[PDB]
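Thread: sanity check for a docking pose with magnesium ion

Original post by kr_44:
Hi all, I'm comparing my docking run against an independent structure prediction. Below are the sequence and the ligand SMILES. Could someone generate the full complex and paste the structure tokens? I mainly care about where the ligand ends up relative to the chain.
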Amino acid sequence: LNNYLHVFYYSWYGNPQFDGKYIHWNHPVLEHWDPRIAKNYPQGRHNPPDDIGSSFYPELGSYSSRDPSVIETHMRQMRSASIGVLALSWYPPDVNDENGEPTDNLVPTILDKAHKYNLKVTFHIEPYSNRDDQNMYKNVKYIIDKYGNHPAFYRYKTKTGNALPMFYVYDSYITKPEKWANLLTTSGSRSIRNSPYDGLFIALLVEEKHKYDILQSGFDGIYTYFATNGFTYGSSHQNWASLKLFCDKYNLIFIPSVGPGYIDTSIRPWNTQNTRNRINGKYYEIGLSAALQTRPSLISITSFNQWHEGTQIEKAVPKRTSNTVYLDYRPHKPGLYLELTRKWSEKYSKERATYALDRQLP
Ligand SMILES: CO[C@H]1O[C@H](CO)[C@@H](O)[C@H](O)[C@@H]1O[C@H]1O[C@H](CO)[C@@H](O)[C@H](O)[C@@H]1O[C@H]1O[C@H](CO)[C@@H](O)[C@H](O[C@H]2O[C@H](CO)[C@@H](O)[C@H](O)[C@H]2O)[C@@H]1O
Ligand SMILES: [Mg+2]
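Reply from moderator J.T.:
Ran it for you. Here is the predicted complex with magnesium ion included:
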């Protein structure tokens, strides 16, 4: 079970049984800004259970994230994958992504289930409305207060010093460095440094130039999230050497994000440019290779169950309707992506042991 391997996990799926309505599965098709173009693509919400907002279909069908049994199935699959850590997509209590409902209520249950399968839960902080340095304090406080004690709560052990919580900050570049430095530097007017609320804050690097904003912000590390090789500077495999080199010089944790593929045309019909066919695992293994070549301190997987963007490694099954031939993992099995992860997790976990200075050779 590899505690250096994180996977982005979403708890925002709903269905009438547990949640009394479909949530996320019944995703609306997102309009292109330009109506001249949008009118030539589909319109409306998908109609689960047979029409979902995904190119792929799950073994668990149009499941509820709040289904105790689904959570369990999810832990089992991540444990089979040799992934120690799910990075849970998070919105403050009583707040939600624009196409979902609140999910903070469900964190306690997800922690209990991670524990049951000997897994760790860290927090992927989404761009909630008017997110800034001040409510980021209130909310880092909230996360560590309410869930910090829990045995499944994730802390990144340094060989020396306290183990520190990790916050992955999605779209960190939205907030100016001088505001971040209020929270993330020692002298910050609202610094969490050397306090009960310290942690490792990982910035999303999109453009090369964000390097310097991230340095100035006082962030501990950078990650790249996007599963499409070439989508951003940061999500392009060729640039991962440079970011590793950069982070090393500046004592930042470089966390590359690897995807098995991308396809979101079920809900962004204009976004074909960023489709990546899986070619039966070869895309995902190129990604995993490029990541391990940087001898990184952690690796992130985009994603476990982002079904809308077709980046999920969660088990998928062939399915056809009167209009739709869903993608699937044929000729391989529903677990191909869980198996390819196990393969590369064990290979990482072995090479990673030869990195430390006190474990170098003649
Ligand atoms: C132009 O915007 C995109 O690209 C920039 C970087 O150049 C990002 O900083 C933006 O956040 C944005 O990336 C998101 O959207 C693109 C599509 O353009 C997608 O390819 C990405 O993977 C990003 O969105 C996903 O991941 C984040 C993090 O977990 C999450 O907030 C997003 O949630 C949105 O998309 C869902 C459908 O895919 C939708 O249901 C939800 O309500 C949205 O907030 C995506 O999971
Ligand atoms: Mg050190």
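Strands lie at 2-9, 83-90, 120-125, 166-169, 200-204, 221-223, 253-255, 257-258, 299-301. Hope that helps with the comparison, let us know if your pose agrees.
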